[PDB]
RNA sequence: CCAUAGGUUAAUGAGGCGAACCGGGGGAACUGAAACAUCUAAGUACCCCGAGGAAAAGAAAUCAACCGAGAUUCCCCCAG
RNA sequence: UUUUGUAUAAUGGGUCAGCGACUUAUAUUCUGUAGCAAGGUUAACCGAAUAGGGGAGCCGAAGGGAAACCGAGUCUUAACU
RNA sequence: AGGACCGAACCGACUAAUGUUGAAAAAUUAGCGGAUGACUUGUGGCUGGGGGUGAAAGGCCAAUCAAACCGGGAGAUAGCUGGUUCUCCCCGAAAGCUAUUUAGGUAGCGCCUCGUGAAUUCAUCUCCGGGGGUAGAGCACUGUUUCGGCAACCCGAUGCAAACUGCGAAUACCGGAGAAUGUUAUCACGGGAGACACACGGCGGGUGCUAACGUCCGUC
RNA sequence: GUAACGGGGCUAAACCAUGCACCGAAGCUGCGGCAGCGACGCGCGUUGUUGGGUAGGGGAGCGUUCUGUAAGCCUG
RNA sequence: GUUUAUUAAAAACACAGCACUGUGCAAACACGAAAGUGGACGUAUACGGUGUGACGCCUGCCCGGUGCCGGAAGGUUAAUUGAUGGGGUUAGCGCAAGCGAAGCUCUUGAUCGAAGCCCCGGUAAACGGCGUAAGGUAGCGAAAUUCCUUGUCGGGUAAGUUCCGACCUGCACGAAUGGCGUAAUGAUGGCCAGGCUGUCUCCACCCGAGACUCAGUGAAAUUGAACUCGCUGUGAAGAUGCAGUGUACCCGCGGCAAGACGGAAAGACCCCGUGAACCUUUACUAUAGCUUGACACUGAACAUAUGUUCUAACGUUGACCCGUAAUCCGGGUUGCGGACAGUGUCUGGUGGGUAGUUUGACUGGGGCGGUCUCCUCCUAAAGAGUAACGGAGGAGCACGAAGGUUGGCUAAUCAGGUUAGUGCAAUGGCAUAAGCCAGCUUGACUGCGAGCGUGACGGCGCGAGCAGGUGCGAAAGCAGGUCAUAGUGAUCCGGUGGUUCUGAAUGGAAGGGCCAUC
RNA sequence: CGGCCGUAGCGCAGCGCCGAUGGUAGUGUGGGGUCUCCCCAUGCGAGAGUAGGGAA
């Protein structure tokens, strides 16, 4: 990131946002995932 | 500069405002111009007050 | 040992999709009155980096 | 041993970037002036920095015209 | 004054040495930050005390999240 | 060797022999190559086992948004041509 | 009597020559100062490193002193200098711009290389469409200039200009079309760089004295 | 130290003009050979063309010590 | 007398003498985390520190500055204390909106509060100054000081930048960082004379030790390789080695040093490095020490938070007794102090005593000066761009109208035709005016934005059109600031308002995000 | 109401305005000299002025 001392880029932009912690416990199934549970019903158990 | 920073604010209690200046030693009689207020999407007055 | 990422890097770009950074741009932190509504409008969305910068970014951010 | 000199500004890259019979897109800057060293002519709007731009798609057209034989930009809507 | 301090003798033990590891008492600077003071190097080097075949830790005034786990220690993940 | 430029009167070497300088570990990216393929691969550890077990994990098959959240969309905006 | 006098021992070290790979890492020779004193000397002791000791020169503290020596942190750090070891084949730079406590460093871009992909993509020439304000020229304008007519203005005659223009090329550049030619010569993305001290010569110039093998740009 | 044609020397062996000859390079051509790249046809042909290089990038190799192949193979 | 052992012996240091100043003894002061020890088994005729430097004649004026000393009216001011106000939470009350006790909690900071500082005085043998604090006295003066300068005059010499004596025009003397003298002293500096001489005119000869030859022993620095000439030219610009040319049989020995940019030491000057060290200070930041107050160790009476008194904590480097052969230490008795002193924690001041560091770059070397960002013109070679410590000027704003729009209007100059005007430089523009006047106004709007320009990037710029809502106009329309081009500052950290986006068991809250803004 | 934008406008051909031909200046490329500046070959070729036009 050294640019031989001007401001360097990741430093004369800003910082935005905030990290989400329920985002780290949230996850995406695919219609794919499905069929892959045991005994056809599908709950956060059975994913698991 | 001698210009001051002012806030105009809206008078329809959404808290929205501009920003502009004034010369405060020429002109003391408080700026009051209609604008658009975004918050309730029409012109209302708006009403100088301290930065 | 694992590579430490910049931490400063990470506070300020994320990986899009095809694998660019979106960032926020400069600007718009203060001595607003000045600025036109316009340009200040255009700074509000977030942008790509450059192709120049991308480099640049990369070795700041391994593990994006 | 001094200079009261050494000053100059930044060079602001101005004239004319689309010559006559080049095909622009609406939007598109053909010449960056001060004041009106050209004026606006059919299809072409004239900026606030006395930017003359294609209002349509086109071919770029100089012409003279009027009675001080002015400079007209025009866009033959190509 | 009673005494207590002090004195003498006997018995028992200690003392000193040793490469690392271990617990504790103290504790740098060069260096990096392209200078430098916060910060870093590092609780590192070094000095000191003490122990053992290992030491230390250890049986929840611990976590968890409304479901539960069940002392301490060590390894792989979690995760740069 | 260093330089714009060295027969240079710039540097280095008296000669010979021997030794003498891009490595190693761990991360990460790209290329090649091999395996398997919408999957791929296991770590510690168990195992006398270069076997076998172990899928905890990790990467990938979805993105958008600061985020809640929505999702082949999403964000922006009261709303998008 | 005496920090009295002359002068050996003893303690010093003013001058000169020698010596300077010495006889000697400070001496020798001839002279020189003190020589009962704040003298000199033997033995032993004490003061320890940001510390000692110093009738003070930063002197001395084991041939070491503006912070001893030895060991350790330790392979400190070194944008600096040096050096970097067998062979052949292909391609082949830069010494620029921008930024920099930057200027002999470094970063992005430019230029090299390797890979992948893609359009007649690119170049030359011809024809066509364009904007110029340079060279030259000119003097209405801005200034400057001489003569004459009427010391102003005005009229006639004469010049001069990087920051003058009622004129204005060649070239160059942008775009379009068409052949021929050229190992895609073009552009994009990705792996790897190096380079950012340039030199002279020609042409156009600033600077300097149309001085410099001078200096600073442009272009070949 | 001649020391202001490189020297000898030159009255052209100087200068100007015109012309034809010749010399002259690692340029071009000839003959033989090697290699890179691209075409065109079947790893070989034909054809075109290229091959000066520092930093530097890319490609391909030589040789050295050691492990397997090797209780093999060579060696009084 | 002393000194730079090993390039300085001196005018430097010391010195007796002088002065200032501190110090009452458990002295000041110094070495020590401390105990202790030195000072001193001394006691103000003493001891420490500082300056001056025998002696003689002397030592003038200035207290504004900086120190030091003294003062304490007033101002300001630390820890501490926590008044008052504002928030969070929720028992409860409200259909909800919301309100809201107590408690707990986040914040606010009234009052209290010492030294210091400001303030008021003093002090120069304190640091210093001597035309305003006061203007340099006495003495001395071209000087260990005088630039101009070899000043001028006198002396000495044939001739004197030195010397001696004067003069005063002191660039830039001057009174204890002492002034002026001064017998004696000095391996001290300068000048003159007699004697003396190989110092010299100008060298000669001689005696010895080397050098030379023979025998024995036997180094060194240096060294890319050498078949290692002159000259003129050339050339990384001063040639044995290149060109041209001249000269030259091969090889020693004694000699000499012009060249081999000879040998020796990675130039010590100079610059550079975001190198080092040590030194300085009213550079920065700290900090030992010194000092202030609060609380602790720390108590009791009485009087009006201060004062007196008390003893029992505590101190004792007073006396005596015992452990004890002991001048340490401890215990005991007693006297004297006495809640003081002193120490711990906290706290304000002071603090080159000590420590870590910083102290820019460009630059026709560096320094000094100038410059550093932005705008306009020229250089700039008729697209863009283009350098110099090249040539010339400007900006770091202004304006609720000087902005929007509608309607109207036209200048300088003395007829003319923009020679005027433009909020401010210059350039390009401007009459359909962009110039001038008036009416109504807030488009100096919010969300967006086809497309394009300009940048390495961060960014910056131009923009029709779309949605919402608006102004002016009868209407077509025009308006997202101003004739345009300067009027500017990334990020971080934080402030304010809005927004339940987030909210570490849960509900909230804090904090964070997002939007606006400082 | 326009096109056009001085051959078109003024004044009352007198001006403005337009304007050849030729020559000159400059200049791209190549070459040369005695090189502060020029010349030659070739291509491009002004400005000013001249003849002329001209009362749209
Ligand atoms: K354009
Ligand atoms: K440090
Ligand atoms: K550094
Ligand atoms: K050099
Ligand atoms: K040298
Ligand atoms: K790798
Ligand atoms: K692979
Ligand atoms: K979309
Ligand atoms: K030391
Ligand atoms: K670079
Ligand atoms: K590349
Ligand atoms: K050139
Ligand atoms: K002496
Ligand atoms: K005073
Ligand atoms: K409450
Ligand atoms: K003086
Ligand atoms: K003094
Ligand atoms: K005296
Ligand atoms: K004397
Ligand atoms: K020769
Ligand atoms: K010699
Ligand atoms: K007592
Ligand atoms: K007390
Ligand atoms: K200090
Ligand atoms: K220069
Ligand atoms: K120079
Ligand atoms: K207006
Ligand atoms: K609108
Ligand atoms: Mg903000
Ligand atoms: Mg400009
Ligand atoms: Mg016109
Ligand atoms: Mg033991
Ligand atoms: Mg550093
Ligand atoms: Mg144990
Ligand atoms: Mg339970
Ligand atoms: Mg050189
Ligand atoms: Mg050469
Ligand atoms: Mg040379
Ligand atoms: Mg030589
Ligand atoms: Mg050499
Ligand atoms: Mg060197
Ligand atoms: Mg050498
Ligand atoms: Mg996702
Ligand atoms: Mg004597
Ligand atoms: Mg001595
Ligand atoms: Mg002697
Ligand atoms: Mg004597
Ligand atoms: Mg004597
Ligand atoms: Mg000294
Ligand atoms: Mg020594
Ligand atoms: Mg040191
Ligand atoms: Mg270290
Ligand atoms: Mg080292
Ligand atoms: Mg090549
Ligand atoms: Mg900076
Ligand atoms: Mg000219
Ligand atoms: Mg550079
Ligand atoms: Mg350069
Ligand atoms: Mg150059
Ligand atoms: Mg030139
Ligand atoms: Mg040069
Ligand atoms: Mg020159
Ligand atoms: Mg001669
Ligand atoms: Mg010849
Ligand atoms: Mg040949
Ligand atoms: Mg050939
Ligand atoms: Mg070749
Ligand atoms: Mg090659
Ligand atoms: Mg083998
Ligand atoms: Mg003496
Ligand atoms: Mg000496
Ligand atoms: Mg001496
Ligand atoms: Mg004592
Ligand atoms: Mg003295
Ligand atoms: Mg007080
Ligand atoms: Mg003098
Ligand atoms: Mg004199
Ligand atoms: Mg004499
Ligand atoms: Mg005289
Ligand atoms: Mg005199
Ligand atoms: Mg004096
Ligand atoms: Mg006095
Ligand atoms: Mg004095
Ligand atoms: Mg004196
Ligand atoms: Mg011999
Ligand atoms: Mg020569
Ligand atoms: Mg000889
Ligand atoms: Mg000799
Ligand atoms: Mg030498
Ligand atoms: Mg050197
Ligand atoms: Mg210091
Ligand atoms: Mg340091
Ligand atoms: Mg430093
Ligand atoms: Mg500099
Ligand atoms: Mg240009
Ligand atoms: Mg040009
Ligand atoms: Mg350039
Ligand atoms: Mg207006
Ligand atoms: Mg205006
Ligand atoms: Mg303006
Ligand atoms: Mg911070
Ligand atoms: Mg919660
Ligand atoms: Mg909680
Ligand atoms: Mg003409």
Redesign the interface.
């Known amino acids: 990131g050294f640019e031989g001392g001007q401001m360097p880029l990741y430093r004369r932009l800003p910082k935005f946002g905030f990290t989400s912690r329920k985002a780290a416990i949230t996850a995406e199934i695919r219609l794919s995932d499905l069929a892959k549970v045991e005994g056809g019903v599908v709950d956060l158990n059975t994913l698991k | 500069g001698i210009r001051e920073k002012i806030k105009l604010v809206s008078s329809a209690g959404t808290g929205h405002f501009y920003t502009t200046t004034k010369n405060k030693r020429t002109k003391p009689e408080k700026l009051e111009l209609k604008k658009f207020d975004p918050v309730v999407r029409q012109h209302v007055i708006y009403k100088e007050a301290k930065i | 040992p694992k590579i430490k990422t910049?931490r400063?890097?990470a506070?300020?770009?994320?990986k899009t999709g095809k694998g660019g950074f979106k960032?926020?741009?400069?600007n718009?932190?203060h001595i607003?009155?000045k600025k036109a509504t316009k340009r200040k409008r255009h700074l509000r969305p977030?942008a790509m980096?450059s192709k120049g910068?991308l480099g640049?970014?990369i070795?700041?951010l391994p593990y994006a | 041993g001094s200079t009261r000199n050494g000053r100059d500004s930044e060079a602001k890259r101005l004239g004319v970037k689309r010559f006559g019979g080049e095909s622009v897109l609406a939007g598109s800057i053909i010449v960056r002036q001060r004041g009106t060293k050209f004026h606006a002519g059919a299809n072409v709007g004239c900026g606030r920095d006395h930017t003359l731009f294609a209002k349509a798609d086109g071919k770029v057209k100089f012409e003279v015209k009027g009675p001080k034989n002015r400079k007209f930009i025009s866009i033959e809507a190509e």
């Open positions: 910049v400063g890097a506070k300020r770009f994320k960032h926020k741009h400069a718009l932190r607003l009155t977030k980096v910068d640049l970014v070795a700041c």
